């Protein structure tokens, strides 16, 4: 375009490449999110098709990863899938290659995907495990990417890391029901002391079946967030 600056959304391949090369040169901090974890590092290489980072951590593959480039111009958020990985022979670290993003969004706000919203609503998740056993969970918090489920009587063998809860149903009161697949990410036991009660919290990632399902979730979020703000 004719202006110096214009879009918070970048889709031009040439601009995107140009932006990565510049941030590389400025040693801009890149933040990588996966599951529970966030690491800060720098871009180690930029070419026409891919960008590299190096880290000793294991990062899930075959899945789009959330990034944040903490540029001077604002946070540049994008998703990118891992294409290659091996040992970059620096303290024997791992060199990851990611495909260049095809869309960038410059935001001034830090949108940490690891955070989930607490609420007052009567939301539950019901379904059957692989062996036909019924389960029920309280939906304690929720984001557009996942939720925390809670129960005092978990069937732990079906809740291992990356275990899949297929055909799980989100009972969302006034918002209706949403059948979805959940990927178990993390299980912790929270104990309240005052007699003692232990609650199991299972953190899950949504595997949506349609955009319509995600949009419904996003509308609920906007309602919950608004409610939470009005609560201050």
What DSSP assignment string belongs to 168-209? Answer: EEEE-GGG-EEEEEEEEEEEEEEEEE--EEEEEEEEEEEE-S
- Is 186 labelled as part of a ligand binding site? yes
Q: For residue 147, count CB atoms less than 10 angstroms from its CB and return exposed for 0-12, middle for 13-18, buried for 19 or more.
A: buried
* Structure-token pair, residue 83: 């294409």
* Per-residue DSSP letter, 8: S
**Residue 111 marked as a ligand binder:** yes
Q: Residue 184 has which token pair?
A: 């178990």
List where CATH 2.40.10.220 sits in the chain. 110-232
The SS3 of residue 80 is strand
Is 132 within any annotated ligand binding site?
no
Task: Read off the tokens for 29.
Answer: 């901090």
Residues of 182-207 as b/e, b for ≥16 C-beta within 10 angstroms? bbbbebeeeeeeeeeeeebbbbbbbe
Distance CA 198, CA 149 (A): 14
Q: Are strands 94-99 and 117-118 parallel, antiparallel or unpaired?
A: unpaired
Method: X-ray
Q: Is 125 annotated as a binding residue?
A: no
Report whether 146 belongs to an annotated binding site. yes
Beta partners for 34?
37
203 is in an annotated binding site: yes
Q: Is 143 annotated for ligand binding?
A: yes
Asked if residue 128 belongs to a known ligand binding site, the reply is no
d(CA 137, CA 198): 14
Q: Is 116 annotated as a binding residue?
A: no
Topology (CATH level 3) of domain 110-232: Thrombin, subunit H (2.40.10)
3-state helix, strand, coil in the chain (%, to 5): 15, 50, 35
Distance CA 32, CA 101 (A): 14
Give me the phi and psi of 134, to 5 degrees please.
-70, 140
């Amino acid at each position: 375009g004719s202006h110096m600056t214009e879009g918070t959304i970048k889709t031009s391949k040439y601009e995107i490449i140009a932006i990565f090369r510049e941030e590389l040169r400025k040693r801009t901090e890149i933040e990588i999110f996966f599951n529970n974890t966030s690491i800060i590092t720098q871009l180690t290489r930029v070419d026409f098709a891919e960008f590299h980072i190096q880290t000793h951590r294991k990062i899930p593959s075959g899945h789009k990863i959330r990034f944040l480039l903490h540029s001077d111009s604002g946070k540049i958020e994008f998703n990118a899938a891992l294409t290659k990985h091996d040992n970059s022979g620096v303290d024997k670290g791992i060199r990851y290659a990611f495909s260049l993003p095809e869309c960038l969004q410059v935001v001034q706000r830090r949108r940490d995907p690891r955070f989930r919203l607490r609420h007052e609503h009567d939301f539950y998740c019901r379904g059957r495990h692989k062996n036909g056993e019924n389960y029920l969970f309280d939906i304690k918090d929720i984001s557009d990417g996942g939720c925390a489920l809670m129960t005092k009587t978990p069937n732990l063998k079906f809740l291992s890391h990356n275990a899949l809860l297929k055909n799980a149903v989100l009972m969302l009161a006034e918002y209706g029901e949403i059948t979805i697949d959940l990927v178990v990410k993390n299980v912790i036991v929270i104990t309240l002391d005052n007699e003692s009660e232990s609650y199991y919290q299972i953190s899950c990632q949504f595997k949506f079946r349609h955009l319509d399902d995600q949009r419904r979730i996003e509308k609920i979020l906007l309602d919950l967030i608004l409610e939470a703000k009005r609560k201050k």
